[PDB]
Design a protein around this ligand. Structure first.
Ligand SMILES: *[C@@H](CC(C)=O)[C@H](C[C@@H]1CCNC1=O)NC(=O)[C@H](CC(C)C)NC(=O)[C@H](CNC(=O)C(C)(C)C)NC(=O)OCc1ccccc1
Length: 306
């Protein structure tokens, strides 16, 4: 049946994207009820960006300094404030399309959908995983700040990321919707580098289970391993140590497939040491780590291909 890096349907979020302008700087904002959220750096300029003092910069602005556009309609800003690295603009109109929602702070290894936006207009959507080093490998150009990351459960939209910047290695950094950054990054153009990254062990294992669920058992073996023996191979290959909580999270998958977690870890340790044989797993030649156990259950058949 297939396995694809799938994003959540984006409609509920498209209806909340707006454009915000300050002087010469334009970016995207998120319009929920009567508030528009956006990167606070929209109040920056040419040199403002290396060493901005936002408190200082902001006291110099008025509600009318902000130009909010909801499609073709102009939104009148009736108050403003700064919350960590975001600005909260109150506006006179309440977004008619606001969906049920909440703000969440996603954890390293978890995945979400990103709605790339430009000038308040949605451009495309893809799934990303929050990397252990707190960056995400997205696809963003200038104009994309304020684009959001989210998950949907039932008809509730859980926003979890707002884009703010790109680091030297081409990776991306941003904040949750309270404006607190993921990672040790700050919104100023002083040199910063992403920390060293690791492979997300739990996801790679979840992906092997998915590979087995829609048939495909070639990489399995008759061995098993203990957690520690596994973790010694893991350290060697720059993988995150596996833990008992991780072993427990893989219970449902384990059960549905009839393959013990440590047997799967034994399988993974062999893959790590013996390479792949020019063979592929779920159409892939590398071990994928951007799918959570949750993502696998959501997408795969609730019935294994025995
Ligand atoms: C959105 C802003 C708007 C108005 O939409 C952009 C998104 C990025 C553009 C390219 N890809 C993106 O994701 N946000 C920014 O441009 C951001 C504004 C700051 C936080 C006020 N700045 C950066 O993302 C910046 C881009 N890199 C550079 O300018 C150079 C040429 C210096 C590499 N990244 C940055 O400043 O990182 C810190 C840093 C690391 C290493 C050396 C120097 C600076």
């Amino acid at each position: 049946s297939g396995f694809r890096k799938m994003a959540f349907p984006s409609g509920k979020v498209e209806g909340c994207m707006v454009q915000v302008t300050c002087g010469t700087t334009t970016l995207n904002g998120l319009w929920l009820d009567d508030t528009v959220y956006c990167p606070r750096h929209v109040i920056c300029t040419a040199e403002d960006m290396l060493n901005p003092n936002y408190e200082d910069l902001l006291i110099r602005k008025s509600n009318h300094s902000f130009l909010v556009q909801a499609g073709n309609v102009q939104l009148r800003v009736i108050g403003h404030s700064m919350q960590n690295c975001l600005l909260r603009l109150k506006v006179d109109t309440s977004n008619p399309k606001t969906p049920k929602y909440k703000f969440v702070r996603i954890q390293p290894g978890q995945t979400f959908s990103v709605l790339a936006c430009y000038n308040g207009s949605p451009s495309g959507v893809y799934q990303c995983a929050m990397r252990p080093n707190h960056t995400i490998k997205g696809s963003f150009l200038n104009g994309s700040c304020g684009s959001v990351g989210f998950n949907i459960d039932y008809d509730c939209v859980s926003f979890c990321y707002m884009h703010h910047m790109e680091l030297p290695t081409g990776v991306h950094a941003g904040t949750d919707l309270e404006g607190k950054f993921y990672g040790p990054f700050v919104d100023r153009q002083t040199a910063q580098a992403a920390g060293t990254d690791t492979t997300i062990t739990l996801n790679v294992l979840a992906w092997l289970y998915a590979a087995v669920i829609n048939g495909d058992r070639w990489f399995l073996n008759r061995f098993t391993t203990t957690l520690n023996d596994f973790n010694l191979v893991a350290m060697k290959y720059n993988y995150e140590p596996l833990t008992q909580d991780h072993v427990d999270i893989l219970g449902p998958l384990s059960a549905q497939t009839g393959i013990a977690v440590l047997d799967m870890c034994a399988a993974l340790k062999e893959l790590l040491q013996n390479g792949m044989n020019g063979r592929t797993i779920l159409g892939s030649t590398i071990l994928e780590d951007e799918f959570t156990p949750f993502d696998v259950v959501r997408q795969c058949s609730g019935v294994t291909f025995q």
